[PDB]
Design a protein around this ligand. Sequence first.
Ligand SMILES: O=C(O)[C@H]1NCC[C@@H]1O
Length: 262
Amino acid sequence: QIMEPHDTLSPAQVDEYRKNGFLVQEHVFDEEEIELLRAEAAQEFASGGERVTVGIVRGVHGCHLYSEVFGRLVRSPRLLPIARQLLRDDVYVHQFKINAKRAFKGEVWEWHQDYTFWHHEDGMPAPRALSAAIFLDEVTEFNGPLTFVPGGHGSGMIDADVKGWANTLTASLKYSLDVETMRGLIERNGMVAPKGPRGSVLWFDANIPHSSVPNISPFDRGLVLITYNSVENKTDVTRGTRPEWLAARDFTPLTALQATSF
Ligand SMILES: O=C(O)[C@H]1NCC[C@@H]1O
């Protein structure tokens, strides 16, 4: 329901986003909305098939192509307008995934830049993309928050070690940054793990270096990540290596959900 004005970031929020390369908006969705997304996530974890990642499952990819709920979510007036605003274009979804770190579980996700994968694997011409991470649970110091180098997107794509899409979905990553490159960045820029309550959205740049650590809390950390790409910056489908549920190929510009009686 687009029953009120489309959401936009304030000028200060935009500046903060461009300068740091990430930004948290608190309390975007309420508990009932988050519960609908948790239930739909659980159903996709149960029947995603080859799109799932694992012991017990912690990942699924491309759900907005298969789920009515997730298809509407990406068009939400809480999300689509800000993605247009930050990318200064019409947009489409390049990638959709859900990442759960359960209580007392999780892995060390090595430092990486999303754009590096999308440039090399999918043919994304420029880093004119971003991810919206919806917090299905409160993100704290202790349940494995996404961790960033603030301003580290202004490096461009950093020269990365390489180890098809064999290890793109897994915490041992195909493209990871040197112990060496990372020290220089962090001495200069520091590190930040954005936190916020359930229903928050964390916007981050395609090129920001990020990482995370296990969840040593007794609470789950579920994240829905929607990667919006500029339509002008659509991926070169001739250099693409991965299926539609990792890298979308329908570049129709999205429009927002209209308010309807159903
Ligand atoms: O491979 C991908 O496209 C995603 N998984 C880890 C880095 C990206 O977000």
